Amino acid sequence: TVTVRDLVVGEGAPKIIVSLMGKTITDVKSEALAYREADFDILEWRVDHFANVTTAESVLEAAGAIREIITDKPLLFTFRSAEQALTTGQYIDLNRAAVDSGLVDMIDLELFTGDDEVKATVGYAHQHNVAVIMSNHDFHKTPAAEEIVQRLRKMQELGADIPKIAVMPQTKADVLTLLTATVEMQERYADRPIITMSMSKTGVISRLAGEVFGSAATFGAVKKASAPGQISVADLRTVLTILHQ
Amino acid sequence: MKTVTVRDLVVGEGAPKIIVSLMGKTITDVKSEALAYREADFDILEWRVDHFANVTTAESVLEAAGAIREIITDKPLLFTFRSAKAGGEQALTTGQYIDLNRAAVDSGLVDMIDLELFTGDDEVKATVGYAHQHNVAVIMSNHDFHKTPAAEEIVQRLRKMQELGADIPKIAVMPQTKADVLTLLTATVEMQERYADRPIITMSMSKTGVISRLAGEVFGSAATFGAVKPGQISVADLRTVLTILHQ
Ligand SMILES: O=C(O)C1=CC(=O)[C@@H](O)[C@H](O)C1
Ligand SMILES: *[C@H]1C=C(C(=O)O)C[C@@H](O)[C@@H]1O
Ligand SMILES: [Cl-]
């Protein structure tokens, strides 16, 4: 398990993560305020939708604003690489800044960033008591089950506290491939919780069936989804609770 | 896209249909259960006639079928004698079991009958023709309570049920592992997409397989079982999830 704040990830029913996507500090504040009564467990700040992402002061300022409004839930800092492109150097310093701010409980680092940069950045996070979700995505297709499994193992190998993979199905069988890889990884290789999802409405069951197949957290939407296939946070909590009985 | 209409219900379209089973031993029990279930939100009422103690008394079976139809006037009634080989409550010879089903058809009180896959091909074909003549639909079923056959073996069974005339091929299998639940889902998708010219009903049993009861709209199973109430998923919870997944 992985305990963030007072949240234990990888035990009981899967935990719910919602994404905050504001462009400006005004949007970030109004979204955070609106999310405050929503029923979720971890708040993900999707900094890649933040217009002033290349200004350090602005990012720090926006993280504080979120933290001031959402005071109990764990905060996850995520720059998902697609609108404003960044260089590897920019991406790493951004995450380092986040870690050193004290305003975030977890960071997301992409698997295909670079081994040394990743291990370096992972080390820095842990010494600052910040958890690392190491992630990989494919928004166009689903890799073979054994490849999905290889990527999750590589993330464990790099020090991830929570390996994460999100893939896009093109067939219903592709949703089953994602689940097959989840089962295989969790049962045979995982020594930490993992997060897996097959995107789109076709893959929704992968957002619901985490307790049996092995994914420890799942994303839901408050009003706008952060990825296709996310159902409302309320609907998600409803289904996880039924499945936990 | 492949559907079967039973009474006014279209099976195979929209959200999967919820089946509840009546398991009472006596006419009194049957009536009580039917009245209790009318207070629940299901689609199809299955009468598990193997539980009915007076099953070998034709008049008793006809009386009970009439009583149920008085209470549950809207919903389709499926007549199902689960054989003792399948861990039903009582033994009937093959001839008795065919006769029991022919009598359910002849009664005019049931909308569907269940016939087991390995009953006897020639008698199944005759019975299916008889049922069709009376506008009674046939669910053909097979259960593996011990294990999950390979996907292609599950597909093979479903295909044979269509070949025999089934309106709705139905299979239930027991997972021993988590991958087994996915094998049943794989067989459901392969059947629906490549070979089905009928709606199918598939299920992975036990707690571990409950996702197979929820995900039929995507994967291809036209109906699911719940309980009106410790044990399998409730009709209320099943409806809650099916509704969400239909949105
Ligand atoms: O195929 C069946 O009649 C059933 C199989 C099961 O595993 C039961 O939970 C279900 O209510 C009825
Ligand atoms: C990770 C995965 C997402 C999903 O597929 O729900 C949403 C995205 O914001 C997260 O980074
Ligand atoms: Cl059989």
DSSP-derived letter for residue A192 is S
Residues of B in contact with A172 (CB under 8 A): 189, 193, 218-220
Question: Under 8 Å CB-to-CB from B104, ≥6 apart: which residues?
Answer: B49, B61, B65, B79, B110, B113, B136
Q: Say how many C-beta atoms besides its own lie within 10 A of residue A122's C-beta.
A: 19
Please state the length of chain B.
247
Contact B80, B104 (CB under 8 A): no
Breaks (C–N over 2.5 Å) after residues, chain B: 229
**CA B193–ligand 2 middle distance (angstroms):** 30
Residues of B in contact with A184 (CB under 8 A): 179
In whole angstroms, how far apart are CA A34 and each of A37, A47, A78, B193?
7, 18, 20, 43
- Two tokens, residue B169: 């091929």
**Nearest bound ligand to the CA of residue A210:** 2
Which residue numbers of B belong to the known binding site?
Answer: 21, 46-48, 82, 213, 232
User: Phi/psi of residue B101, each to 5°?
Assistant: -65, -40
Which domains, ranges and CATH numbers included, belong to chain B?
1-247 (3.20.20.70)
Q: What is the resolution of the experimental data for this entry, in Å?
A: 1.6
Residue A149 corresponds to which amino acid? V
Residue A108 forms beta bridges with which residues? A78, A133
CA quadruple B183, A211, A168, A180: dihedral positive or negative?
A: negative
Report CB contact under 8 Å: B189, A176: yes
Residue B20 forms beta bridges with which residues? B45
Distance CA(B231)–CA(B247), nearest Å, equals 27
Which residue numbers of B belong to the known binding site for 3-dehydroquinate?
Answer: 21, 46-48, 82, 213, 232
Ion ligand 3 neighbours, Cβ < 5 Å: B 116-118, 142
- Two tokens, residue A219: 């994303």
Residues of B in contact with A176 (CB under 8 A): 182, 185-186, 189
Report CB contact under 8 Å: B214, A231: no
**CA B19–ligand 1 middle distance (angstroms):** 9
DSSP letters for chain B: ---EEETTEEETSSSPEEEEEE--SSHHHHHHHHHHHHTS--SEEEEEGGG-TTTT-HHHHHHHHHHHHHH--SS-EEEE---GGGT-SS---HHHHHHHHHHHHHHS--SEEEEETTS-HHHHHHHHHHHHHTT-EEEEEEEESS----HHHHHHHHHHHHHTT-SEEEEEE--SSHHHHHHHHHHHHHIIIII-SS-BEEEE-TGGGTHHHH-HHHH-B-EEE-B----SPBHHHHHHHHHHHH-
B residues 125-164 lying closer than 8 A (beta carbon) to A: none
Question: Under 8 Å CB-to-CB from A162, ≥6 apart: which residues?
Answer: A2, A9, A10, A131, A132, A133, A134, A192, A193, A194, A195, A216, A217
Contact A74, A106 (CB under 8 A): yes
Residue A126 corresponds to which amino acid? H
- Two tokens, residue A39: 């029923």
- Two tokens, residue A186: 């969790």
